[PDB]
Symmetry: C2
Subunit: 100 residues, 2 copies
């Protein structure tokens, strides 16, 4: 279609990964460092973890900061936490009506 609509589709495609969703859920809960994310239920190696975090960083969904020999990651702006909140709200309704 249009190039603008290609960016809208590529935006949702960036979130269509199980590992990337769990990273966002942990960052919405509280600020996580690379070691805390590496020791989480995401189950990715340090190299795979940096690759997925790099995709979310260039997409403007996560932000990184150095606090002393470490990189603390967090969600960029509160609108990301609002996006995931409404996303799971819609997913909870479609799954409830699909089972019932």
């Amino acid at each position: 279609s249009e190039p603008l609509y290609k960016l809208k589709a590529e935006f949702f495609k960036t979130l269509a990964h199980p590992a990337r969703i769990r990273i966002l859920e942990l960052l919405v809960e509280r600020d996580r460092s690379v070691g805390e994310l590496l020791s989480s239920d995401v189950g990715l190696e340090s190299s795979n973890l940096s690759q997925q975090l790099g995709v979310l960083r260039r997409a403007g969904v996560v932000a990184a900061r150095r606090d002393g020999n470490a990189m603390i990651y967090s969600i960029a702006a509160p609108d990301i936490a609002e996006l995931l909140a409404v996303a799971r709200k819609v997913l909870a309704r479609v799954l409830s009506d699909r089972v019932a």
Copy 2:
């Protein structure tokens, strides 16, 4: 985990320029099969949104309206900062 496998399929369904325009046309007003900028194969893409639970043809629930609203708000901030 099958739970997060379903969360990815929710965003993967909406990751299509044709399906996004269908949702944007249905969130403004009820559209018919004849009225449906998409430029479409149309019965195949429209059937996926019906099975996903977002298309009734009209909008399923008002939660989809605020979903596209916060999605455009987030994306507008990203483009205003990534460019």
